[PDB]
Structures are given as structure tokens and as C-alpha cells.
Paper text:
The most abundant protein in human urine, the glycoprotein [name] (UMOD; also Tamm-Horsfall protein, [name]), is conserved throughout Mammalia and produced primarily in the epithelial cells lining the thick ascending limb (TAL) of the Henle loop in the kidney. The protease hepsin then cleaves the CTP and UMOD assembles to homopolymeric filaments with an average length of 2.5 µm in the urine. The results, together with previous data, showed that UMOD assembles to a zigzag shaped, linear polymer, where the core of the filament is formed by its bipartite zona pellucida (ZP) module with the subdomains ZPN and ZPC. UMOD filaments encapsulate piliated uropathogens through multivalent binding via their N-glycans to the lectins at the tips of bacterial pili.
Author numbering:
A (entry chain D): 444 to 584
B (entry chain A): 328 to 443
The structure:
């Protein structure tokens, strides 16, 4: 005979995002508050740190900045809106997205109009399969 | 009435049972196996007395498989139990699964301050 037990559970992959200060993302930033003028660029990369790195590709899908730390603020300045670079700002440049364990991009600095002095960054992340589905962005126009 | 536990960690899954095994059903020794026989159990005394196995959450370390949805990703293996090398009256097994979502919300914890 056989006496079968079926259990369940769940967990999450750890995933992180960090800023950088070079051409090739040499020196990441560790401080808690960054003071840089609007002549300086914002080189930003993401990273997949959990596991199963052999199978899942890291695709950036929605990367936006907001003047408040709370992620659901209605004021959003978009950088990547739907899996594609925003082409209005003529300085945004995306180098790698959807091909490895890290997504990287580059914009120039801004400050929101009105009575605001802080800028926070937020991103959403989709994990696309390297073996089942095409993951590199196709974007024109 | 056999209290199990599950810990679907970031890199590895873990199924563990307590030492009421020595009092339940007369299990004098504990043999614990996975779908691949080379993965076996060990002893765990960190908080209470536990007996556990360890599997990575990938495709084929200890014969775990990836069953994937469009919203989740679920790994699974099957554990085996006995009190002797040969089973004669009860083929006991415990089927487990850990699911993983594919849609993350990561935010940069540090803030900025520009000078115009
Ligand atoms: C994409 O893939 C993911 C990964 O599998 C799916 O997410 C899981 O969906 C299933 C199906 O709803 C969830 O399973 C659980 O089903 C139980 C009902 O079925 C059992 O119980 C009846 C008797 O009631 C039996 O006859 C039957 O044979 C089954 O054994 C529910 O009871 C569960 O609710 C549980 O919720 C949580 C679990 O952590 C606890 O509070 C309780 O234990 C409670 O019982 C549940 O509905 C499973 O949980 C989902 N996993 C998740 C969300 O991580 C997606 O549904 C799928 N998407 C698709 C197909 O579109
Ligand atoms: C983020 O900010 C909003 C308001 O700016 C906080 O309030 C929520 O507002 C939404 C609609 O915008 C409502 O649906 C929620 O019910 C509101 N929640 C509460 C608790 O009032 C929201 O709480 C903030 N998020 C935090 C603090 O995590």
C-alpha cells in the first residue's frame, strides 16, 4: 500500500538594484543620500541575486522615478514604459536588457517642477525564459 | 498527525521532520531518500531535534523538475521514508512543491538630491 501526503509552500528570488559612476559601472554607490548636479549622469543597473541563473533572463519592464518614497505616488517620470526606452528625452540610452542576470541603462539627471526636493527610483521586473520565449526587446519608433 | 515543515529558500528547498518519529510508528532508525538515491538525509539540532533533506531549486540536482506557469514557477520532488532498508508493509512518501512568482517589485533604497 501507500500513504501519500501532499504539502505546499512558496518563496521568492532575491533581486536588487544599485547605482554606478563610470562608463562600465565600475564603482557602485553605497551611501544613503546622493548629491550630484544636473550635469551628471545616472548610470543604473539591476541584478538577479537569488538563483536559477542558468534558465531565467532578467527583463526590465517599467522603470520610473517619483518624487516620493511611497511607490504608489501618482507623479511618475517614466524611463522604460512598456519594455522599451522612452524616446522623448534625447539622452536616455539602454545598453543591455533581457539578455543576462543584469539590466543596465543610463539617463541624465532631473528635478521635478514645483515644491519637491527628493527623487526616488522604482522598477518592475519580469523573468523571461531563455529556452521558451524570445526575450530581447524589439523596439522602433 | 506527523508534523512536517517546509522552507522554500532563495536557493534551496528543505523538508524536515521531528523526533517524534522515534515515538510514532516505531521508527527506530530513519532512512530518508529523494528521487535520486544519492541525496539523503542528515540530522538537525539547531532549534529542536529535526531530521531533514536538502535540495537545490534547479532542474535536475536531485531529480527535481520545473513545472512552470505564466505567473509562477513550481519545483517538486518526492521524499521516501522507512524504518529499515526494505519496505514490507507501508511505502510511505511525502510529496512536496515550492512555487516561485515571476513578477518582482524592486526599488532603489537610496535617494537623490540634485542642484539646478
Ligand atoms: C499558475 O500556477 C500557479 C502555481 O501552481 C497556480 O497557483 C496555485 O493555484 C492552486 C489552484 O488554485 C492553489 O492551490 C490550492 O488549492 C486548494 C483547493 O484544492 C485542494 O483542496 C480540495 C479540498 O478543498 C481538494 O479536493 C483538492 O484535491 C485540492 O487538494 C485550496 O484550498 C488552496 O487554498 C490554500 O491557500 C493557502 C495556500 O498557501 C492557505 O491559506 C491554505 O492552505 C488554503 O487551503 C489553494 O487554492 C495554489 O495555492 C496556488 N499557488 C500559489 C498561489 O502560490 C496558479 O493558479 C496558476 N494560474 C493559472 C492556472 O491561471
Ligand atoms: C502611498 O500613498 C497613498 C496616498 O498617496 C496612501 O494612501 C492610499 O491611497 C490609495 C489611493 O491612492 C488608497 O486606495 C489606499 O486605501 C490608501 N491607503 C491608506 C492606508 O490610506 C498609501 O497608504 C501609501 N502607501 C504606503 C504608506 O505604503
Amino acid at each position: 500500500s501507500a500513504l501519500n501526503i501532499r504539502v505546499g509552500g512558496t518563496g521568492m528570488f532575491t533581486v536588487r538594484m544599485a547605482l554606478f559612476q563610470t562608463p562600465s559601472y565600475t564603482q557602485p554607490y553605497q551611501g544613503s543620500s546622493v548629491t550630484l548636479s544636473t550635469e551628471a549622469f545616472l548610470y543604473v543597473g539591476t541584478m538577479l541575486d537569488g538563483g536559477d541563473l542558468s534558465r531565467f533572463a532578467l527583463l526590465m519592464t517599467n522603470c520610473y522615478a517619483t518624487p516620493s518614497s511611497n511607490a504608489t505616488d501618482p507623479l511618475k517620470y517614466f524611463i522604460i514604459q512598456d519594455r522599451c526606452p522612452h524616446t522623448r528625452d534625447s539622452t536616455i540610452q539602454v545598453v543591455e536588457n533581457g539578455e543576462s542576470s543584469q539590466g543596465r541603462f543610463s539617463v541624465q539627471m532631473f528635478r521635478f517642477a514645483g515644491n519637491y526636493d527628493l527623487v526616488y527610483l522604482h522598477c518592475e521586473v519580469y523573468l523571461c525564459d531563455t529556452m521558451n520565449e524570445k526575450c530581447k526587446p524589439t523596439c522602433s519608433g
